[PDB]
From a paper:
Compound K-5a2 features a thiophene[3,2-d]pyrimidine central ring, and replaces the cyanophenyl right wing of ETR with a more extended piperidine-linked benzenesulfonamide group, while keeping the 4-cyano-2,6-dimethylphenyl structure in the left wing of ETR. In the case of E138K RT, since the mutation does not disrupt the hydrophobic interactions between the inhibitors’ central thiophene ring and residue 138, 25a and K-5a2 maintain almost the same binding poses in the NNIBP and similar buried areas with each of the residues along the pocket as in their complexes with WT RT. There is no structure available for E138K RT and K101P RT in complex with either ETR or RPV; however, the structures of these two RT mutants in complex with K-5a2 and 25a provide a structural basis to understand why the mutations can render ETR and RPV less effective. In the structure of WT RT/ETR complex, the amino substituent of the central pyrimidine ring forms a salt bridge with the carboxyl side chain of Glu138. Transplanting Lys138 from the structure of E138K RT/K-5a2 complex into this structure reveals a severe charge-charge repulsion between the amino group in ETR and the side chain of Lys138, which would destabilize the binding of the inhibitor.
HIV-1 reverse transcriptase (RT) (hereinafter referred to as RT) plays an essential role in the viral life cycle by reverse transcribing the single-stranded RNA genome to a double-stranded DNA copy. There are two main types of RT inhibitors: nucleoside RT inhibitors (NRTIs), which act as chain terminators and compete with incoming nucleotides in the polymerase active site, and non-nucleoside RT inhibitors (NNRTIs), which inhibit the activity of RT noncompetitively. NNRTIs are a group of structurally diverse compounds that bind to the non-nucleoside inhibitor-binding pocket (NNIBP) located ~10 Å from the polymerase active site. NNIBP is a hydrophobic pocket that emerges only when NNRTIs bind and induce conformational rearrangements of the residues defining the pocket.
Residue numbers in the entry:
A (entry chain B): 4 to 213, 225 to 428
B (entry chain A): -1 to 554
The structure:
């Protein structure tokens, strides 16, 4: 890779000046070893004080391996980097990926280190390995090549990648390959046995046409991804409390579905009755409940993905290891809902479960739409920002905001 | 001539679009002009500056200043303008080490590097921007024009470029001498080691040996300053550390700037003096910005100050860090949203102390504050020691498990153990998850007229108990809370309450144990006294009996 691609920031925007956050000694030592080798390989270089920019860095362990990986938080640089139309006006997101029976995710970020970064842009990739307790000046570097996690790296590399994939694509016309940041998503409908080998067939391709983590494979089955429609209880005896909760749920659902009615069911709650008193359903209330049940079977109307708007992901803690979430662009027009349980690690660690939920939801968002949602997280900012990097295992990072007032609607997805 | 390596130049630029400075040189007295010509002649002989021609269009004013018992004139180049137009730099000297993160060193030498400073050349392409002019006597000849060849004192980039140039020069020496530590800040180079003093004095020599290869002359820091080192407000002693003496001024009249300075000192002091409190004192400077405004001290601020004075009577000291021992952090609740903590490795030998104050807010509870304190100490400990300490917290393991499993947010506290030191943090009420059999059911509601501010609040129950209370100067939200309060007041130890108030649910589901709203506080006091409370929400105006009835009773 000889010629660099001219890269620039957006009009009237300077480079990132983001504070490095404190790192544990073990992550510093890991980054020191990593960056020493990258510097020997020419991928990064020491910079002097005339470079004022900075992007935070930390270290992670990808899912199911013991070697530290450097992770740069390029979120600020990414949003300040010019919008990219690599060689064409845009690679249409493949609507077919979300339908494949199996999708495997490959870390191909290491391929980026073979392309030089435009020399005029390098200063904007500055980062700091901090010392403990400010005992020594942080170690200052910038990238000489396409960095993992930067928006422009897949863009600039897209020409080189399409060529590597051509012979494989030419041979397997029904396999769907989609590239998002440092990752490749490879979906087939065939047996996992041949799927796997077929996956390895594609690794060798990148191995002959060229990795510390290329051996790994994150396996997904989006054809088995299950949604969460709105369900109403089926009971033989309703207490006053049961009906109160039902009318509340139906009233909330009426903002989503037209023609939900609660008149007949509210009729049952005539008088000032004890909450535990059993109320027989009339025939009018049962019909109304049946008509509501029917309405709720059908999907929401006029829900369409608008590629110009952000995706918003809300998450609720339901307790006992269970989490519900909804993805939408306008309120009450959910594009996707879901529910998780028994998060791999952390039967006793809420924040680790939430971090894993965020990663799984972001992965679903990439498959379905090719971009990451903005999260509304049920957690105090200070708790989240102290701990999430300890459980992070993806090479991208979405945006997030914090919910400080308890939503009343948690109980509706319950 | 022993060849010396050149110090690599740092390339420098002005901010984009901006040009160099063009500030007129003031008039100077004949005496000052003579003085400046002598100084600059010497500086030119030493290579620091050079005469330039008239084509250079830039200029920075120069001044002459006199001192008390140094009857010298001293030079002064006012680079204020040039700094405004100079690019930003990486300033590598933001934070300083905290003493509690340092390890003991048998021997410490301090070298002077103010002289090596001038060996750092200034980027050639940038020198033109540093031009200045000595006016001539009687303005009868052209002013003498000079520019800098070295980092000018007072120029924006000199600290960072100098610090960076030294670090680079030192890099190989530090890496090939893992048994010493080197710290630089300003014109001082601090070298420490656990070697015997003789064998340490030799490392020092080798360092001079190393430094000279860039032609850097560096002798001991003149009048080597007996322990402790007065550094960044600390007293670094060989075996202990503290803040420099903290003396709280005695006064009858306390003013805005006094209380600011008083909190400054107390905050500085709280990193080693345990149990410092600053809420009531900090309280008194809520919004005033006239530092001359006098403020009376609440009797709760005098008691707090007198409490601080007692803690300041005898000096306290911290110990240095031992990486082979555990790191432990212990927190106490002090009241009024205040928290204090100690970090130590052995009991009774604090590395440092600290405090935490609750965030501004209408409603809050002790467990949420304790969690915030834990996060603050975690992050401070990562900074200072590169690791999380083990926590000792005044909360029962069972309390915490009940809190986090039932709290609507994700929450986490790292490895910790209970320490039975009152007051203990506890949960003060827990709402039922299901309606209570045999408990009376209160349907509550309230409403207020937006124009007149007249309201009503009350309830109707399944046993026919009823109450409506007329209210003045109220609001919908207040009447909704008042209604729940009335139901709590008038019910037995177990009660089911039905409200349509999304506002009230939002407060109560946050599980406050204390509020700035007297009304919420009164509700909390009632919840504490109950044995069981189930709170149910229903949507307003849906014909939900009981709710409908009481909505009518209160909507006048
Ligand atoms: C060397 C140094 C000096 C100062 C000052 N002002 C500040 C910093 C941050 C320094 O930098 C480092 N200091 C240390 N530890 C400390 C431990 C405590 N003492 C005080 C002392 C010791 C011995 C004598 S004595 N008996 O020689 O008179 C007198 C005073 C100083 C060194 N560790 C590191 C690790 C990386 S940098 C660095
Ligand atoms: Mg009402
Ligand atoms: Na209390």
């Amino acid at each position: 890779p000889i010629e660099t691609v001219p890269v620039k920031l957006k009009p009237g925007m300077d480079g990132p000046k983001v504070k490095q956050w404190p790192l544990t000694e073990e992550k510093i030592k890991a980054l020191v070893e990593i960056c020493t080798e990258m510097e020997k390989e020419g991928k990064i270089s020491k910079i002097g004080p005339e470079n004022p920019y900075n992007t935070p860095v930390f270290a992670i362990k990808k899912k199911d391996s013991t070697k530290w990986r450097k992770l740069v938080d390029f979120r600020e640089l990414n949003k300040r980097t010019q919008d990219f139309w690599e060689v064409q006006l845009g690679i249409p997101h493949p609507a077919g990926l979300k339908k494949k029976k199996s999708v495997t995710v490959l870390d191909v970020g290491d391929a980026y280190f073979s392309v030089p970064l435009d020399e005029d842009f390098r200063k904007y990739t500055a980062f700091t390995i901090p010392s403990i307790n400010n005992k020594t000046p942080g170690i200052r570097y910038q990238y000489n090549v396409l960095p993992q996690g930067w928006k422009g790296s897949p863009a600039i590399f897209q020409s080189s990648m399409t060529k590597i994939l051509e012979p494989f694509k030419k041979q397997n016309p029904d396999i769907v390959i989609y590239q998002y940041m440092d990752d490749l998503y490879v979906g087939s409908d065939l047996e996992i046995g041949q799927h796997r080998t077929k996956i390895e067939e594609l690794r060798q391709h990148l191995l002959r046409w060229g990795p510390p983590f290329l051996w790994m494979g994150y396996e997904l089955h989006p054809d088995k991804w299950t949604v969460q429609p709105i369900v109403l209880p089926e009971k033989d005896s309703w207490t006053v409390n049961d009906i109160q909760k039902l009318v509340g749920k139906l009233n909330w659902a009426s903002q989503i579905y037209p023609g939900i009615k609660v008149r007949q069911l509210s009729k049952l709650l005539r008088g000032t009755k004890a909450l535990t008193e059993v109320i027989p359903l009339t025939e009018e209330a049962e019909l109304e409940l049946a008509e509501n049940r029917e309405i709720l079977k059908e999907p929401v109307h006029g829900v369409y993905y608008d590629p110009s708007k952000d995706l918003i992901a809300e998450i609720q803690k339901q307790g006992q290891g269970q989490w519900t979430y909804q993805i939408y662009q306008e309120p009450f027009k959910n594009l996707k809902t879901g529910k998780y349980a028994r998060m791999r690690g952390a039967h006793t660690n809420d924040v680790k479960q939430l971090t894993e939920a965020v990663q799984k939801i972001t992965t679903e968002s990439i498959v379905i739409w090719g971009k990451t949602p903005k999260f509304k997280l049920p957690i105090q900012k200070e708790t989240w920002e102290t701990w999430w990097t300890e459980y992070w295992q993806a090479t991208w990072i979405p945006e997030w905001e914090f919910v400080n007032t308890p939503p009343l609607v948690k109980l509706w997805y319950q | 001539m022993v060849p010396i390596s050149p110090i690599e130049t740092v390339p420098v630029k002005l901010k984009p679009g901006m040009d160099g400075p063009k500030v007129k040189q003031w008039p100077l007295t004949e005496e000052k002009i003579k003085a400046l010509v002598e100084i600059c002649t010497e500086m030119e002989k030493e290579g620091k500056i050079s005469k330039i021609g008239p084509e250079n269009p830039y200029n920075t004013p120069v001044f002459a200043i006199k001192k008390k018992d140094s009857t010298k004139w001293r030079k002064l180049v006012d680079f204020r303008e040039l700094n405004k137009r100079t690019q930003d730099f990486w300033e590598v000297q933001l934070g300083i080490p905290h003493p509690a993160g340092l390890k003991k060193k048998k021997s410490v030498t301090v070298l002077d590097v103010g002289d090596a400073y001038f060996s750092v050349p200034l980027d050639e392409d940038f020198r033109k921007y540093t031009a200045f002019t000595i006016p001539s006597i009687n303005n009868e000849t052209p002013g003498i024009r000079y520019q800098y060849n070295v980092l000018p004192q007072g120029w924006k980039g000199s600290p960072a470029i100098f610090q960076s140039s030294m670090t680079k020069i030192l890099e190989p020496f530090a890496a090939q001498n893992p048994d010493i530590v080197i710290y630089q800040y300003m014109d001082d180079l601090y070298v420490g080691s656990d070697l015997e003093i003789g064998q340490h004095r030799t490392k020092i020599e080798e360092l001079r040996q190393h430094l000279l290869r860039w032609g850097l002359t560096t002798p001991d820091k003149k009048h080597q300053k007996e322990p402790p080192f007065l550094w960044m407000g600390y007293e670094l002693h060989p075996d202990k550390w503290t803040v420099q003496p903290i003396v709280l001024p005695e006064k009858d009249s306390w003013t805005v700037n006094d209380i600011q300075k008083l909190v400054g000192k107390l905050n500085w002091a709280s990193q080693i003096y345990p149990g410092i409190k600053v809420r009531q004192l900090s309280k008194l400077l809520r919004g005033t910005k006239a530092l001359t405004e006098v403020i009376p001290l609440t009797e709760e601020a005098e008691l707090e100050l007198a409490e601080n004075r007692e803690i300041l009577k005898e000096p306290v000291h911290g110990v240095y860090y031992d990486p082979s021992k555990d790191l432990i952090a212990e927190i106490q609740k002090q009241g009024q949203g205040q928290w204090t903590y100690q970090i130590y490795q052995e009991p009774f030998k604090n590395l440092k102390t600290g405090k935490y104050a609750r965030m501004r807010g209408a409603h809050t509870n002790d467990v949420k504050q304790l969690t915030e304190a834990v996060q603050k100490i975690t992050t401070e400990s990562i900074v200072i020691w590169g690791k999380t300490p083990k926590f000792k917290l005044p909360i029962q393991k069972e309390t915490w498990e009940t809190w986090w499993t039932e709290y609507w947010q994700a929450t986490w506290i790292p490895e910790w153990e209970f320490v039975n030191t009152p007051p203990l943090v506890k949960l003060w009420y827990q709402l039922e998850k299901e309606p209570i059999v045999g408990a009376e059911t209160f349907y509550v509601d309230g409403a207020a007229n937006r124009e007149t501010k007249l309201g009503k609040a009350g309830y109707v129950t399944n046993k026919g108990r009823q109450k409506v209370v007329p209210l003045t100067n109220t609001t919908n939200q207040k009447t909704e809370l008042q209604a729940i309060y009335l139901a709590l007041q008038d019910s037995g130890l177990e009660v089911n309450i039905v409200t349509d108030s999304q506002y009230a649910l939002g407060i109560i589901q946050a599980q406050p144990d204390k509020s700035e709203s007297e009304l919420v506080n009164q509700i909390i006091e009632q919840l504490i006294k109950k044995e069981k409370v189930y709170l149910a929400w229903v949507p307003a105006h849906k014909g939900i009996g009981g709710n409908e009835q009481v909505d009518k009773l209160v909507s006048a």
